[PDB]
Amino acid sequence: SSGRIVQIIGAVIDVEFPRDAVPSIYEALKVQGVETTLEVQQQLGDGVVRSIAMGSTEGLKRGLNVDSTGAAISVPVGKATLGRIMDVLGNPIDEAGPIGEEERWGIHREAPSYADQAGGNELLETGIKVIDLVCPFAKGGKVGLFGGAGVGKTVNMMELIRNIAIEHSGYSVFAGVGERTREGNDFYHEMKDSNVLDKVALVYGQMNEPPGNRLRVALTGLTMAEKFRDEGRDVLLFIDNIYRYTLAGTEVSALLGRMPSAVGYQPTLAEEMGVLQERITSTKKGSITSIQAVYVPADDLTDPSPATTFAHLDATVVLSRDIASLGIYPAVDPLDSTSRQLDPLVIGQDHYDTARGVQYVLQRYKELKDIIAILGMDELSEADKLLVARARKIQRFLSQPFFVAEVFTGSPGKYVSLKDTIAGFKGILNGDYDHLPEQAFYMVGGIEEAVEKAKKL
């Protein structure tokens, strides 16, 4: 039997049902005559449910009849989703007609079991020098790209989509969660021009949409990636802002009758994070390689939302505001970014000693910077002068021109192999380039290009 709307306060709508026909938690509801869907969050007692709209609340009144669907929000799955743009409800928001799917899946699911887990250690080359040096990725692993506003998370994600997903033989799912409509249109025309769009399913919920869309659009994209993983395939999954799933959960939270926790957050922060993050993992049936960029509020890594995201990932890449402010891009902080595949039994001994030597020289120069800022360069010893010069060359050689950033630099992009990176950083560490100026290593690529640039200064 149908209910009626009794209260509309913001995005939160209360519906009264008869007592024998109360809808379950996470049941989808259809408002009669207006094209809006409600998702049940709470059962308040006396027949009343509290829900969040999956559309705008401008055409809603009290007294409107609401029907129950008897199930959760179901989205299309299969290879009919490839080449299409869908919203949170699975409706097409391109103009290419209807999706001819053969199966629909609900967006709410259990995590896989402990016995279902399977973890490999196969190396995944990226072609970015600092990422191949200090944070090596894993096939079927999980990658975070932490960083504040404007430090390069989207440009780094586009470079990883260019250097991984174009030559990938399997399928991909991109999930735009609470981000810019301009970037979503830009990416759709970039995959359409490169003839890559037929392997990639796009799911979009932008930042101007109601908080219910931004709250479930990552579950919609993960449901299509779960169908591709449980078919036995190797799946890629890219989420440009997993933080927007959290922040929309902020926006409804005290209107749902929750007292606030510390730094204004919801009290269910870690549990809502763990329910989404524990389904992304690779199983014994198939593999999911996931790349998620995580927004860091006001560059504070001790803010509770990135600090809860840090434990869920295998490879963490942290972007610094300070390094991007020195004009150095990709702007990865090489002392704050670690990986589980930084092991001598995984990458070899030589790669591990090159990466720890780079980190030791940079951590030493971090302690010598204010000393040169107060007294000057001449007041140190000789090994300090040699280490500060080798460290400034290490900090310029960590930079790289990108193919997706040629609209920002003006210079063409470079692909650098792992062995070129290890040989170049070993050649700077061994003092085989102590005669070159520090400006020769800035925005070049391989170590041979630094030698060619030093003759033009």
């Binding site: 005290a254 007292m259 606030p260 926790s261 510390a262 730094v263 204004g264």
Partner: protein, 57 residues
């Protein structure tokens, strides 16, 4: 006279670096008082936001 002036230069450098260490410690003590004031104000502001959020629900 040149060698005795070099010894006087090193003695004056000793007195100047002892004075620089003492003035650095004075600035550290002033900044530590400012830090403890900011820590107490941050705890009081966060508790006022939690109590005012809990009273409205």
């Amino acid at each position: 006279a040149v060698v005795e002036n070099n010894a006087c230069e090193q003695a004056a450098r000793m007195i100047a670096m002892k004075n620089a260490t003492d003035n650095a410690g004075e600035l550290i003590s002033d900044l530590q008082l400012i830090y403890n004031k900011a820590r107490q104000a941050a705890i009081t502001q966060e508790i006022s936001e939690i109590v005012g959020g809990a009273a409205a629900v």
